[PDB]
Amino acid sequence: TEFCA
């Protein structure tokens, strides 16, 4: 899953 921080 993209956009993780």
Add this chain to the structure above:
Amino acid sequence: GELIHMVTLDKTGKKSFGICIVRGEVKDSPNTKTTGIFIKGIVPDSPAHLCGRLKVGDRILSLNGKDVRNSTEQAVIDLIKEADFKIELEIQTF
């Protein structure tokens, strides 16, 4: 019933804050919709998870005082990575 509240996450001792986000929309009415940044996932045992006050589906209104209502996902991620060990999130939930 919805509510806007503040949540501070500190990733000290952790690899990341533990939030995955996406651009989304919800119908605020009955004939209109609102777009924004939503929490799509939470990493187990991460600060976001241990916090207990962040839920999947919550929208992020601002980050460290910066309005992100119309931001791209990448822009929010960059903002988070530019932060030290803490981020204060204005969250709209329920």
